[PDB]
Structure formats: C-alpha cells, structure tokens
Design a protein around this ligand. Structure first.
Ligand code: FES
Ligand SMILES: [Cl-]
Ligand SMILES: [Cl-]
Ligand SMILES: [Cl-]
Ligand SMILES: [Cl-]
Ligand SMILES: [Cl-]
Ligand SMILES: [Cl-]
Ligand SMILES: [Cl-]
Ligand code: NI
Length: 324
C-alpha cells in the first residue's frame, strides 16, 4: 500500500499542474498555488465542487454529503477534496485568489511529542516536524495515519506559529465519530503521523478595530483558543469566548495553552437548548459590533451562523470552520 502515480492536472484557464493517486485534487491544486475553492476539506460543505471534463478519478468518500443526491447520480460533478486522479485530468472550476495558500502547503512527517488532558472530553496532542511550524491562527491540518491510508481528517491547530516545529491539536477522549487517524496506538508519545497544511482561509483578521467573540463547540475549542490568543496578542482587549463541554465546570488550564486568563471572559455551555442560545442570551443586540469566529460540529456551526445573520451581523465579520 505504498506506490503512487503522478498525472497532469489541467484546470481550464490555468497553467497545467500535476496531480496524483496519493493526495486529493484540492491539495495538488493548492500545492501548485491555485486558488481552488474549499472550506471543510473533508467532503461536507460542497464548496470545492468541480466538473470532470476528461480523465478518471476515484472518490475517498462516495457518500460524501457535500455532493447532492442528484450530483452523485448524474453528470460529471465531483468534489476536489475527496477525489484522486487515476489519469491525466482536465477539469473546470471557478478559481479565486482568496484561496491561494497564504503559506505554501506541504506534506510533513510529524512525531507525537506530548499528550495531555485538556478537559474531561478533549485530549491535546503536540507533534514535532523537522520543519518550522508555520501557520496563521485559525488554520488547520489534514492528518493521516499510515495504518489507514485513505483516512484524511481535518484538525485546527491549538497553539501558534513557532520555529521549534510544534503542532498542537485537540482530539476526542472517546473515539466516537467513525474513522479517525487517532487510533489509540497513535495517541502515544513517539507515534508518527502525516500533516498536510497549513490549510484554511478562516484565520484571524487583524486591524478590524472590533472586539473578538470566539465560539467553540467540542474539539472546535482549538480554533477558538488560537483566535483568542491572537486577538489578545494584537490588542490586549478582552476576548469573549464561549465553549461547549458535556461535563459541568471542566476548566482548561489557560496558562498551559499560553493564554492570559485576564483579558479572557469564558462562558461554558454544558452539553435545554444549546450554545448559540447561551451566546444570544448573553450578548443580545450587541453582536453586530463583534468580529466573530466559530468552530465545532457542522450542525452547531450552521445553527449559530443562522442566529448571527438573523441578528444583523454582517456576513464578513463571521468566520468559521466545520469539518466532517
Ligand atoms: S471543501 Fe470539499 S466538500 Fe468542503
Ligand atoms: Cl490528501
Ligand atoms: Cl466525490
Ligand atoms: Cl503537498
Ligand atoms: Cl478524534
Ligand atoms: Cl457543540
Ligand atoms: Cl467537534
Ligand atoms: Cl498568536
Ligand atoms: Ni498503481
């Protein structure tokens, strides 16, 4: 389960690049500097849709919900984040500049170096690469475990850009979901994984002059924490942060995540109704004045953005990441 092939990737209107049997069309494109649209990079949001003009591809997730029942059954529309090339390809997609990697993405061999209890639910995993850890606050990595070849999943970085090559992620204590590269044989010090990134365009925006509100459900606390840290570093203003954990009062040691608890206004929502009703109650009609960042389970993120827009928050002050 080790050899891979390389093929030509022609994107109509762009320079002929390369693609392969070893990575998705998304990352090959992005790796080539092309702004192929994407958000989730994991088969759910539908944003990376392209039309297969010619050539043959293989899907990592045939049931991927980002592709509608219609599209899965009729025509030549596929998802770039889920598809590998099995020959030279010609595709058509609306390329945009805002998706060009801020920082050149790469395939990195990374070793687990530290694991520690974040919360009753969250486990923090710190890995090291031979290369500097270079990423913006709010970006993610796609993570693979050689045990499971076709099992790429997305995880927001929790720490910050450092020259020591450290990448931290928050993962679930209970192995739920379904398939994950975080087998328990891989949550031990010395395990080797593969990080692709940095990915994502929902990173922190400086110079807004607005206050930050970070909303993180479940493992989305990684993203929420990286934005909160970066806001405090920027302005020293108070950052309001809301998060969901199922057990009452499971505090996170904010000094271990390099965050000053002063300049930090934390409200936990114990996992009736949920997190976006706790935010709406607490802040009322003041939300439109904040720069808002969310992460979490797709249903939670979608409900919250609906609440936000319904409460008059400009679309361009809302930033999010939801992975499937
Ligand atoms: S980016 Fe491919 S479905 Fe979300
Ligand atoms: Cl990939
Ligand atoms: Cl697909
Ligand atoms: Cl790459
Ligand atoms: Cl997990
Ligand atoms: Cl949640
Ligand atoms: Cl989550
Ligand atoms: Cl930072
Ligand atoms: Ni082969």
């Amino acid at each position: 389960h080790h050899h891979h092939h390389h093929y030509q990737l022609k994107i109509e209107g762009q320079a002929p690049g390369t693609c392969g049997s070893d990575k998705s069309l998304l990352v090959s494109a992005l790796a080539n500097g092309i702004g192929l649209p994407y958000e989730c990079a994991s088969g759910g949001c539908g944003v990376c849709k392209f039309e297969l003009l010619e050539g043959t591809v293989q899907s990592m997730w045939p049931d991927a919900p980002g592709l509608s029942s219609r599209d899965r059954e009729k025509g030549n529309r596929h998802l770039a984040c889920q598809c590998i090339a099995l020959s030279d390809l010609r595709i058509k997609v609306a390329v945009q500049d805002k998706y060009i990697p801020a920082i050149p993405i790469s395939k990195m061999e990374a070793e687990v170096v530290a694991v520690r209890a974040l919360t009753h639910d969250l486990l923090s995993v710190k890995l090291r690469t031979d290369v500097p850890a270079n990423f913006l606050p709010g970006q993610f990595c796609l993570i693979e475990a050689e045990q499971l070849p076709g099992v790429v999943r997305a995880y927001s970085m929790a720490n910050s850009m450092n020259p020591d090559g450290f990448w931290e992620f928050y993962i679930k204590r209970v192995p739920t979901g379904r398939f994950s590269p975080w087998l328990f044989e891989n949550r031990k010090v010395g395990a080797r994984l593969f990080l692709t990134g940095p990915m994502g365009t929902s990173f922190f925006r400086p110079g807004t002059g607005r206050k930050s509100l970070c909303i993180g459900g479940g493992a989305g606390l990684s993203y929420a924490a990286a934005i909160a840290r970066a806001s405090i570093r920027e302005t020293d203003k108070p950052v309001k942060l809301f998060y969901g954990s199922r057990t009452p009062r499971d505090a996170v040691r904010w000094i271990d995540i390099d965050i000053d608890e002063d300049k930090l206004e934390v409200v936990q929502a114990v996992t009736i109704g949920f997190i976006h009703q706790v935010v709406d109650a607490a802040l009322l009609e003041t939300l439109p004045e904040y720069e808002i960042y969310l992460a979490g389970p797709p249903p939670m993120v979608d409900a919250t953005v609906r609440m936000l827009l319904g409460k008059g928050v400009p679309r361009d002050q809302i930033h999010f990441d939801a992975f499937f």
